[PDB]
Design a protein around this ligand. Structure first.
Ligand SMILES: Cc1ncc(COP(=O)(O)O)c(CN[C@@H](CC(=O)O)C(=O)O)c1O
Ligand SMILES: Cc1ncc(COP(=O)(O)O)c(CN[C@@H](CC(=O)O)C(=O)O)c1O
Lengths: 382, 382
């Protein structure tokens, strides 16, 4: 008989997708509300990358591509993870997916049998649990503390390991805290995976938005259990392009390529060519990477000051582009504080779903003129 | 502990993906083998559509888009299904997905609880069962006969309806038979869905490659149970673009939008703008549609003749671009016949996986010069 399934019936809505829609419509019915919501640059994808997407169209590069992605993008990927991430993978252990989202979604479906446990460390990015659950798994969450700077303590984690525990999700830089996990913690979590036999998913998609610290890929350590998950969506202002990449054990890679086929067949072919240009033309991308990074650092400092100038508490991020801001003042909860703040003319994402209660998540990847126009409304409301 | 899941472990490989790879490498180890394998035009996506993808890049239209797709492409979609398909949907009941594949894959995950039954009519396109199974459902297949011209008989179907039966998959035009189901059969199958309360998935992606007959969208009939699934991949030579669309009950649409988000977030933003141009600039697309259709009809007739001239039996398709060709002569099975034929210098897809035993599936969407270079090898082998 008819009716929706119960796995798509049990999923919780995106807090981000929900807040955006809202913001938008008001921008439509009069309303000019500065929106510090979504995690996407304001910068437009570099010209050297665009030129190549035109060059792709021009050469009629519009046919189907392997479910695992074109052999070229695939090869440059084996040098990115290599040259940059220090990892040592051959192209067969590489895979192009439809965003960072696909590489995780395919990843969880290929290693999660119903009832398997996956340890997420809170606060976490809104999706991880929903993906881990849509696959049949169960969310075992380890807390990470503001007093500890949100960097995880491998003992609270080791403690969480059951015989069901199949995977552990680490994210450095971190959404929504901005925390950059230091080599040793990362190297520690890796050995837990090796010691208790489980996969370590490592979502290093903000590896480049690293203001202070060094970026360590845990995969260098546990190459047989680690599953690195990157993406060309943050580093190159390519959020609308929907290109992601990942790597790890050959074994689990082809399995992700299988789910890749039944679902999307393979990602855009024009977009894979453009992405290749971002990975191979170094001189031009490095120039852009650095350029963007500084505008982000500047915005961070500008925000973090003004926040502190109103006495609004928030932890200092060393990566990505989010600042978790305690709303204790504006209102009791994260919810109402957001409804208060939206009136003031500022769209923020409540940290209820990130397991960041009390706080609200704001993004400084937007204009400078805007962090300011927002910072002024906070004043009144404050 | 480690290891792959059992849902990605139980899936059978793509016969098409497998044959292609093969063909390629040989073209890639000396070998010039005419390949009538994949279902994709040789024509390159129209200029009016490409111009707009450049116009999109030019205006920096490269940010994230709603999981359900940009509101514009979404609105033109409510007029396509309306104006063209006679359906009556508002944009909320429209959805943009990553190809026709995604719209089905999201569709089966949103309405399939484990053990639910889905009736596929054989011969069917290679994926349907694989998707229906990856979701937990079970494949209950109704046969369609070459003597009946592959068009289904609603009684063998009515007969197959159990209390588990959740969905029924119809495909007109048909891959791999080319059969265009007549208004009344389609209108009948719809009433079974209404009578026994179940969803009718209708994969009308070749609606435009209709040489002889009229195209009926069953959704006009059972608007509450029908789930129309189209795609801009065949009509506009946009296979590499990966854009698909669908519509039906608001209820099931947002559920598909949910799975859409956790998996890909949303499709390419450049590509959604280009697609919009294909749907709104009529004068220019109709011109292309007709233009392509005739080159396809010509190739069909050219194939169907030469096939018959060698006494090779095959049914006459009135749609899409495949011809199911009985290999009884070349060899006993479909498998070996293909291995025989590959020697002759011709890549064909064995009909073992389409439930089209004895036959082999060949595509005439390729060059004319090629159907002929293939037709000559058949001779010798024959
Ligand atoms: C922590 C994390 N990991 C992966 C991704 C996915 O990248 P894409 O596939 O979507 O490009 C993201 C992405 N994004 C942001 C904004 C969003 O649209 O979800 C966020 O929620 O901060 C993140 O975080
Ligand atoms: C019957 C049918 N439905 C869906 C698709 C794929 O939709 P898109 O997402 O690629 O637009 C196809 C198309 N082509 C192939 C299958 C494949 O391997 O791509 C086929 O005809 O062999 C078809 O048929």
């Amino acid at each position: 008989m008819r009716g929706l399934s119960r796995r798509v019936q049990a999923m919780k809505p995106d807090a981000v997708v929900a807040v955006n829609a809202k913001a938008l419509e008001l921008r439509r019915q009069g309303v000019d509300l500065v929106a510090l919501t979504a995690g996407e640059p304001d910068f437009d994808t570099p010209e050297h990358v665009k030129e190549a997407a035109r060059r792709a169209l021009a050469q009629g590069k519009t046919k189907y591509a392997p479910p695992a992605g074109i052999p070229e993008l695939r090869e440059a990927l084996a040098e990115k993870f290599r040259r940059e991430n220090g990892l040592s993978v051959t192209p067969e252990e590489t895979i192009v997916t439809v965003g960072g989202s696909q590489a995780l979604f395919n990843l969880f479906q290929a290693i999660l049998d119903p009832g398997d446990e996956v340890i997420v460390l809170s606060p976490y990015w809104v999706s991880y649990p929903e993906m881990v659950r849509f696959a049949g798994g169960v969310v075992v969450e380890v807390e990470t503390l503001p007093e500890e700077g949100f960097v995880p303590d491998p003992e609270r984690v080791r403690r969480a390991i059951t015989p069901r525990t199949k995977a552990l999700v680490v994210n450095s830089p971190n959404n929504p805290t901005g925390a950059v996990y230091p080599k040793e913690v990362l190297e520690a979590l890796a050995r837990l995976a090796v010691e208790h036999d489980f996969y370590l998913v490592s979502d290093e998609i903000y590896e480049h938005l690293l203001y202070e610290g060094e970026h360590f890929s845990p995969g260098r350590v546990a190459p047989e259990h680690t599953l690195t998950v990157n993406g060309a969506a943050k580093a190159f202002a390519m959020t609308g392009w929907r290109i992601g990449y990942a790597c790890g054990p050959k074994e689990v890679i082809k399995a992700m390529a299988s789910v890749s086929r039944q679902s999307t067949t393979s990602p855009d072919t024009i977009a894979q060519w453009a992405t290749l240009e971002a990975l191979t033309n170094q001189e031009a991308s490095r120039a852009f990477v650095e350029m963007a990074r500084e505008a982000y650092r500047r915005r961070r400092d500008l925000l973090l000051e003004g926040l502190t100038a109103l006495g609004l508490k928030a932890v200092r991020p060393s990566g990505a582009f989010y600042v978790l801001m305690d709303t204790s003042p504006i209102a009791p909860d994260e919810v109402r504080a957001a409804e208060r703040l939206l009136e003031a003319g500022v769209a923020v994402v409540p940290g209820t779903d990130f397991a960041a209660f009390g706080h609200v998540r704001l993004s400084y990847a937007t204009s400078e003129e805007n962090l300011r126009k927002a910072l002024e409304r906070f004043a009144r409301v404050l």
